[PDB]
Amino acid sequence: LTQPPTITKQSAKDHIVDPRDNILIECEAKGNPAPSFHWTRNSRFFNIAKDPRVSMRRRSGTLVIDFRSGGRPEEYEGEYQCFARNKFGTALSNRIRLQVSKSPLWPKENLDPVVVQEGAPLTLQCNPPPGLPSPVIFWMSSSMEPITQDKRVSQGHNGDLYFSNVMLQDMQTDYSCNARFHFTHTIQQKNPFTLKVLTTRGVAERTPSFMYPQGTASSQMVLRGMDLLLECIASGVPTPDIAWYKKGGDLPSDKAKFENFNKALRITNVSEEDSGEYFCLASNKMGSIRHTISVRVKAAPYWLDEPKNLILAPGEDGRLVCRANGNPKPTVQWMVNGEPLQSAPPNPNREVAGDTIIFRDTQISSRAVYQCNTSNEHGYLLANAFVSVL
């Protein structure tokens, strides 16, 4: 029966949508008395009433927009936050950054016909327009024939097409960069590149070079839990081979997978242990060079000690611990029903110790719905926890 508000469901922290079926910023909550809801858009009170498009729901705060009457979601991009309040206190949802799933066109460009000496290297740079999330990329002939890839010719993760050495058959098709988008499935085509190779009467066998990762070394930061992608594209006449190593250690055979005609190396659920120096070798015939990649592993906050609701008997000492591990180390900010602790109705029964709160002689009053934001450069965590007396 007598329990303060608690968020039941909510739209994702990163709520992305296509201009198709109208938006649904979700927010639901429990509570003894059915909670009332209000919203903020970019930190200012979001006035539902003066907006024709948006409307609230059956016994909930879930919103619904409607563009069936001359409207565009491109103006409706921003940070949303739901507030669930009842007689006891108020609980908050995450900060919903609603963004439109763009599948934009390529800038109009009259491309130069590509002329390169035979056997020499070439990089057909794609450079796609943004779009969210990143579009899957592939190369096709302008007449929709799939371009076959091998150790000699392959694409990098950025979408660029890499020719180790340009042969004569590379004129058996033209080359157009395609970008397939995730949820709209729209594909955008960039103008076809026409290759005009020049025969210079020479197999001139050359030492290998580094095409994509420029020069000698490179650094990479990567988030705990995400994937780590290492690449090495080489330009050599006798088509170069790539090989991989980690300095003073073995590459984890389970988490690691050679991709792209050995040109790339993925490590899946990366952790601190996966940081350090990795290197690759472009093992030609006339030589063998090396690239060194430095991998540092930073981390978005993840819960060590998430605060839970507190049901205490009058007079009992209670405590809330909000601790997350991250890199850089997370910060803790406390809130009482949305209002920042600093400017909250004073309470003598409360002692604050950074990430730890302690409630001595919990009494009749003092029933509220505390918040915890633990954050760092790379992310945050928001916990709701109430302090009800029995």
Q: Which residues bind a copy of itself (CB under 8 A)?
A: 18, 20-21, 105, 108, 138, 140, 144-146, 180, 184-189
Residues binding ligand NAG: what is the number (CB under 6 A)?
6
How far apart, in whole angstroms, are the C-alpha atoms of residue 264 and residue 155? 10
Who's near 314: CB < 8 A, 6+ residues apart?
Answer: 362, 363, 364, 389, 390
In the complex, what is the shortest distance from the CB of residue 220 to a copy of itself, in angstroms, rounded to a whole number? 29
Task: State the amino acid at position 27 in one-letter form.
Answer: C
Phi, psi values for residue 372, rounded to 5°: -135, 120
Under the binding rule (CB under 6 A), the answer on residue 382 touching ligand NAG is yes
Residue 35 in contact with residue 90, Cβ under 8 Å?
A: no
Which of a copy of itself, ligand NAG, none does residue 140 bind (CB under 5 to 8 Å by kind)? a copy of itself
Q: Cβ closer to a copy of itself: 107 or 113?
A: 107
How far apart, in whole angstroms, are the C-alpha atoms of residue 189 and residue 349? 65
Task: State the amino acid at position 7 in one-letter form.
Answer: I
Which of a copy of itself, ligand NAG, none does residue 382 bind (CB under 5 to 8 Å by kind)? ligand NAG
Q: Cβ closer to a copy of itself: 184 or 268?
A: 184
Which of ligand NAG, a copy of itself, none does residue 95 bind (CB under 5 to 8 Å by kind)? ligand NAG
In the complex, what is the shortest distance from the CB of residue 188 to a copy of itself, in angstroms, rounded to a whole number? 6
Which of a copy of itself, ligand NAG, none does residue 302 bind (CB under 5 to 8 Å by kind)? none
How far apart, in whole angstroms, are the C-alpha atoms of residue 119 and residue 112? 20
Tokens 């430095």 label which residue?
Answer: 294
Under the binding rule (CB under 6 A), the answer on residue 380 touching ligand NAG is yes
Task: State the amino acid at position 253 in one-letter form.
Answer: S
Sole binder of ligand NAG in the list 375, 385, 386, 389 (CB under 6 A): 375
Under the binding rule (CB under 6 A), the answer on residue 94 touching ligand NAG is yes
Of residues 334-373, those binding ligand NAG (CB under 6 A): 373
List the strands of the sheet with 310-312, edge to edge: 310-312, 379-389, 369-376, 331-336, 339-340
Percent of residues in the chain assigned helix, strand, coil, to nearest 5: 5, 45, 50
Q: Cβ closer to ligand NAG: 42 or 271?
A: 42
In the complex, what is the shortest distance from the CB of residue 10 to ligand NAG, in angstroms, rounded to a whole number? 11
Which of ligand NAG, a copy of itself, none does residue 187 bind (CB under 5 to 8 Å by kind)? a copy of itself
In the complex, what is the shortest distance from the CB of residue 380 to ligand NAG, in angstroms, rounded to a whole number? 4
In the complex, what is the shortest distance from the CB of residue 117 to a copy of itself, in angstroms, rounded to a whole number? 31
SS3 261: helix
Residue 231 in contact with residue 213, Cβ under 8 Å?
A: yes
Q: Cβ closer to ligand NAG: 235 or 375?
A: 375
Alpha-carbon 35 to chain mean position: 33
SS3 370: strand
Pairing assessment for the beta strands 16-17 and 90-100 based on DSSP bridges = parallel
Q: Cβ closer to ligand NAG: 80 or 386?
A: 80
Binding span for ligand NAG by CB under 6 A among 112-120, 247-255, 349-357, 375-383: 375-383
Q: Cβ closer to a copy of itself: 145 or 339?
A: 145
The total of other beta-carbon atoms located within 10 Å of residue 257's CB is 12
Task: State the amino acid at position 60 in one-letter form.
Answer: S
Binding-site ranges for ligand NAG (CB under 6 A): 94-95, 373, 375, 380, 382
